[model samples]
Target: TDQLKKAKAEAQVIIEQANKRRSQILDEAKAEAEQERTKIVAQAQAEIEAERKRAREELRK
Candidate 1:
């Protein structure tokens, strides 16, 4: 019975540490995704403005 209890305790500690690392990994992934989204949006906006400027110049000609 004593040996069984010791094994259970070790398993619990491993599981807890695994859970902590899992949480951190997920958090980092979410942050990276957000950064990518912001970058894409900014790039799209710049392209749109450039297209508009070209259209305006063509119309003037």
Candidate 2:
């Protein structure tokens, strides 16, 4: 009975640690993706503004 209890405790500890690491990894991935998305959006907005400016200049000429 003691051995069984010890084994159960070890298993619970391992599972708990595994769950913690899994959440950490997932959070890091989500953050990286969000950063990438923001960068892409900013770049697109800059490009759009540049294009509009060129169009306006051409119209003036």
Candidate 3:
């Protein structure tokens, strides 16, 4: 009975560690997603500026 209790305790520790690792992985993924969104928005803004310039140049003709 004592050995069984010890085994159960060890199992709980393992489950806790796994859950912690899962949370950490999710946090990292969230940060990466935010960075990707920032880069995409910046690229879109640059394209808009370039298109505006082209339109202005075309109108001047």
Q: After superposition, how far is residue 40 of candidate 3 from its true place, in Å?
A: 0.5
Q: Model 1 over residues 12-54: C-alpha lDDT tens digits?
A: 9999999999999999999999999999999999999999999
Where does model 3 exceed 4 Å of error?
none
RMSD of 2: 1.2
**In model 2, what lDDT does residue 38 have?**
100
* TM-scores of the models, in the order given: 0.88, 0.85, 0.89
Backbone clashes in model 3, listed as residue pairs: none
Sort by TM-score, best first: what order?
3, 1, 2
Off by over 4 Å in 1: none
RMSD to native for every prediction? 1.2, 1.2, 1.1
Score candidate 1 by lDDT.
Answer: 1.00
Error of 2 at 45 (Å): 0.4
Model 3 alpha-carbon miss at residue 48, Å: 0.8
User: Candidate 2's residue-wise lDDT over 1-61, tens digit each?
Assistant: 9999999999999999999999999999999999999999999999999999999999999
Worst 10 residues of 3 by lDDT: 52-61
Question: Judged by TM-score, which candidate is best?
Answer: 3
